A paper describes a structure:
T3SS2 expression is regulated by VtrA–VtrC, a member of a newly described superfamily of bacterial “co-component” signaling systems.
We then solved the structure of the VtrA–VtrC complex bound with CDC and observed that CDC binds in the same hydrophobic pocket of the VtrA–VtrC complex as TDC. This unique CDC hydroxyl group forms a hydrogen bond with a water molecule that is also coordinated by VtrC H50 ND1 and Y151-OH. The backbone amide of VtrC Y151 forms a hydrogen bond with the 3α-OH of CDC, and VtrC Y81 makes van der Waals contacts with CDC. The key Fα S123 side chain makes a hydrogen bond with the R1-OH of TDC, which is lacking in CDC. Finally, the Y81-OH group shifts between 0.8 and 2.3 Å in the CDC-bound structure so that the aromatic side chain forms van der Waals contacts with both the five-membered ring and the carbon side chain from CDC. The position of the Fα helix containing residue S123 is impacted by crystal packing and shifts away from the CDC binding site in one heterodimer compared with the others in the asymmetric unit. Meanwhile, the lack of a hydrogen bond between CDC and S123 allows mobility in the Fα helix and alternates conformations dictated by the crystal contacts.
Author numbering:
A (entry chain A): 165 to 253
B (entry chain B): 29 to 161
């Protein structure tokens, strides 16, 4: 099956089978987006074995959807930095 | 009685070796338990559009619950070309040809009147928002 909802706070919804990683990434995402003064309507993140994906939802705009293939496993900091750079750009 | 519902979105994909990116448009229309879909892939391999793919699919969409669906394709066709205006049929690779032999899971994680958020089967797992029309 797909991973279920493993961390949820404010606008962030993380789907992963790693509960610890989910919280680390969720807190890092909230802190990084506040540092950029970026507030999504909702931000969905899915962590899988060889792929990360996210959907940044903003009111009355098309969602920003991204997929990153990773052969090497990425730590929560690099994942957070990826999402934050993609949303900005 | 079933009215036709329209969904659309796009995403960008970054390859593992970061040698290419895909810009992928998804269009899907549903009537009753039937669907047809068009997916367009633009391949950027040099910060430069050097390949296009057009994937057409149709079949049944089965509802397990209001949040769990599965897509049973009857057929998937692929076209390719370096220009969108002159696309040619492309022989399905057995891996993509075999997506027709798997009930492909769609899990709704958020449902609204203007959009839906799903986990679905691209890359063996992807989260995406689809906009309704
Ligand atoms: C068949 C071609 C070319 C592959 C090759 O032989 O190199 C693929 C290039 C991009 C792929 C598509 C692209 O990666 C997005 C989708 C991903 C999903 O896992 C399968 C269907 C997809 C819609 C998929 C279908 C197959 C193509 C269209
Ligand atoms: Ca076919």
């Amino acid at each position: 099956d797909y991973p279920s909802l493993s961390f949820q706070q404010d606008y962030v919804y993380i789907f992963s089978s790693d509960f610890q990683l989910s919280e680390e990434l969720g807190v890092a995402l909230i802190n990084a987006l506040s540092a950029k003064e970026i507030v999504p309507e909702r931000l969905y993140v899915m962590l899988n074995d060889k792929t990360i994906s996210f959907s940044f939802i903003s009111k009355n705009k098309k969602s920003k959807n991204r997929v990153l293939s990773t052969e090497k496993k990425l730590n929560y900091k690099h994942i957070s930095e990826y999402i934050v750079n993609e949303i900005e750009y | 009685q079933d009215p036709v519902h329209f969904y659309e979105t796009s995403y960008k994909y970054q390859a593992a070796d970061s040698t290419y990116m895909h810009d992928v448009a998804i269009n899907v229309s549903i009537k009753g338990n039937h669907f047809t879909s068009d997916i367009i892939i633009r391949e950027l391999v040099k910060s430069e559009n050097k390949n296009y793919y057009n994937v057409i699919g149709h079949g049944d969409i089965i509802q397990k619950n209001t949040h769990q669906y599965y897509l049973n394709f009857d057929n998937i066709d692929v076209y390719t070309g370096t220009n969108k205006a002159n696309m040619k049929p492309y022989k399905e690779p057995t891996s993509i040809s075999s997506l027709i032999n798997k009930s492909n899971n769609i899990r709704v994680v958020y449902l609204s009147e203007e959009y839906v958020v799903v986990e679905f089967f691209f890359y063996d797992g992807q989260i995406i928002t689809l906009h309704r029309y």
